Design a protein around this ligand. Sequence first.
Ligand SMILES: Cc1cc(C#N)cc(C)c1Oc1nc(NC2CCN(Cc3ccc(S(N)(=O)=O)cc3)CC2)nc2ccsc12
Ligand SMILES: [Mg+2]
Ligand code: NA
Lengths: 414, 556
Amino acid sequence: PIETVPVKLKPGMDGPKVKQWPLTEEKIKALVEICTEMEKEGKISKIGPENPYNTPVFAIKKKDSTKWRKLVDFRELNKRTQDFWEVQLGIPHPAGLKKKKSVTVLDVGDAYFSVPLDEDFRKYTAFTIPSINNETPGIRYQYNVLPQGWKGSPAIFQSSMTKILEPFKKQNPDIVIYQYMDDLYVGSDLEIGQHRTKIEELRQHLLRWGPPFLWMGYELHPDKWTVQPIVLPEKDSWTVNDIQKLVGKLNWASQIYPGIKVRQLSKLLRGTKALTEVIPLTEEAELELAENREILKEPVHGVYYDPSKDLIAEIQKQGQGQWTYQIYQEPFKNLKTGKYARMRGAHTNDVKQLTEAVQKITTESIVIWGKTPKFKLPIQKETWETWWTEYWQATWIPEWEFVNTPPLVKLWYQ
Amino acid sequence: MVPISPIETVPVKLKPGMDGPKVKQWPLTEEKIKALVEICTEMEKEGKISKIGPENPYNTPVFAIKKKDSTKWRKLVDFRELNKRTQDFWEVQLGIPHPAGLKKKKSVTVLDVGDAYFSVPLDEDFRKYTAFTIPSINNETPGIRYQYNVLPQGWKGSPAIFQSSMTKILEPFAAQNPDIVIYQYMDDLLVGSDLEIGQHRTKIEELRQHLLRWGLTTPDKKHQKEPPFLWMGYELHPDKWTVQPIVLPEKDSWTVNDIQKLVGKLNWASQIYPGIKVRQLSKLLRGTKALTEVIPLTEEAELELAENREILKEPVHGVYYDPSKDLIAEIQKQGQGQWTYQIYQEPFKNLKTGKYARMRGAHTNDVKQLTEAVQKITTESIVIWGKTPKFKLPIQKETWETWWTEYWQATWIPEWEFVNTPPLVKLWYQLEKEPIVGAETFYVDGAANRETKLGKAGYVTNKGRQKVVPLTNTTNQKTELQAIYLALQDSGLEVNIVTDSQYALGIIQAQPDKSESELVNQIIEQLIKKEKVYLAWVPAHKGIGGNEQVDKLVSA
Ligand SMILES: Cc1cc(C#N)cc(C)c1Oc1nc(NC2CCN(Cc3ccc(S(N)(=O)=O)cc3)CC2)nc2ccsc12
Ligand SMILES: [Mg+2]
Ligand code: NA
């Protein structure tokens, strides 16, 4: 790789100036070792005080490995980096990826380190390895090559990647390969036995055509990803409280589905009855409940993905390690809903469970639409921003905002 | 001639589009001009500045100032304009070490680098922007024009470039001498080690040997200041540390600027003086911006200040850090949303102390505040010691488990243990998850006229109990809370309550234990006294009996 690609920020935008957040001593030591080797390899270089920019850096351990991985939070630089159409007017997101019986995720970010970075743009990738207790100036570096996690890296490298895949793609016409940031998503319909080997096939390619974590493989099965329609109870005896909750749920669902009616069910609640009193369903109420049940079977109407709009992901804590979520662009028009349980590693740590849910939901969003959603997180900002980097294992990072008022609609997905 | 390595120049640019300065030189008295000529002549002989021709179009004004007992004129180049046009730099000197994070060092030396400061050359292509003019006597000859060859005192980039140049020079020495620590900040180099004073004096010598390779003359800091070293407001003693003496001024008239300074001292002191409180005193400066405005001290502010004075009677000290011991943080609730904490390794020997005040809010509870205090201490500890401390918290393990398992948000506190130091943080009420058999059911509603602000609030129950109360100067949201309050007042120890108020549910599901709304507080007091409360929500205006009935009773 000789010639660099001319890269520039967006009109009237300076480089990022984001503060480095505090790091534990073990993460600093990890980063010191990593950056010392990257510096020997020419991937990064020390910078002087004439560079005022900065992007935060921390260290993670990818799923099921013991080696620290450098993770740069390029979110600010990414939104400030010019939109890219690096050779064509855009690579269409493969709608068939989400349908493959198995999708394996490869960390191919190390391939980026073989392409030089436009010398004029390098100063914008500045980052700092902080010292403990401000006892020394942070160690200042900038990238000489395409950095992992930067929007421009897959774009600039897209030409080099297409060629590496050509032979493999030419041989396997039914395998779907999609690239997002530092990751390669490879879906096939053949079985895991030959899938795992076929995945290894693709690694050797990348290995002959050229890694610290390339050996890993994150296996998905989007064909087995289950949605969550709206379900109503099936009971032989309804209390006043049961019917009140049902009418509340159906009233909420009537914002999503037309033709939901609660007149006959509300009719059962005539009087001022004790909450635990059993109310027999009339024939009019049962029919109404059956018509609502039928309505809720069919999907929502006029729901379409608008590529120009952000995806929004909301998450609710349901308790007992269960989490529900909905992805949408306009309210009440869900493009995807889901439910998680038994997040391994933290039966007694809410924040770790939430961090894993965020990563799994972002992974589903990448597969289905090719971009990450903006999260609405049921957590206080100070708690989240203190701990999420401790459980993060993905090489990308989505955006998030915080929900401070308890949504009433948690009960409806329960 | 011993060849000396040249100090690498830092490339400098002006902000994009902007040009160098063009400020007219003031008129100067003949006396000041003579003084400036002598100074600049000496500076030129030393290489700091050089005469330039008339082609240079930029200019920065220069002044001459006089001192008290030193019968001297000092030079002064007003680089204010040039600084506005100079690029931004990386300022590597934002935060300073906290003494509680430092380890003891047997020996400490202080070198002076003010003269090595001038060996740092200024980027050649940038010097033209530093041009200044000494006016001539009687304005009868051209003014003598100079430009800088070194980092000008007062120029925007001098601190960062000097600091960065020194760090680069020291890098090898520090790396090849792991048994010493070098703190460079300002013109002072501070070297410490656990070596015997003799073997320590040699490392110092080798450091001069090293600094000499770039021709940097550095002798001991003139008038070696006895211990303690006065640094960044601390008293750094060999075995202990503290802020310099904290003296709270005595006054009968307290003004805006007095209470600010009083909080500053109290805040600066709260890092070692344990238990400092500052709400009431910080409270007294809610919105005023006239620092000369006098404010009477609430009797709760005098009690707080008098409490600070007692804590400030005897000075307190902290211990330095031992990485081989545990790091422990203990928190106490002080009241009125105030929290105090101590960080230590051995009991009774604090590394440092601190405090936390609750965030602004209409509603809150002690567990949420305690969680916030823990996060603040966590982040402070990662800065100072690079690790999270073990916490000792005045909350029962069982209380925490109930709180986080049932709280609608995700929440987490790191490894901690209960310490039985009252007052203990507790949960003051817990709503039922299911309706209560045998408990009376209250259907509550309220409503208010937006024009007249007249309202009604009340309930009807399954036993035929009813109440509607007429209210004045109220609102929908107030009548909705008043209705729940009435049902709590008028029911037994176990009660089911049915409301359509999404506003009320939002508040109560947040589990406040205290509010700035007296009406929410009254509801909390009632909830505390109940044995069981089930709160059910229904949508308004849907023909839900009881709800519909009471909605009519209150909608006038
Ligand atoms: C070297 C240094 C000195 C000062 C001062 N003023 C401040 C800082 C921030 C310095 O920078 C570092 N200081 C330390 N530890 C401290 C521990 C306690 N003292 C007090 C002292 C000791 C001995 C004598 S004595 N008996 O010789 O008179 C007098 C006073 C100074 C050293 N650790 C590090 C690690 C990286 S930088 C740095
Ligand atoms: Mg009403
Ligand atoms: Na109370």
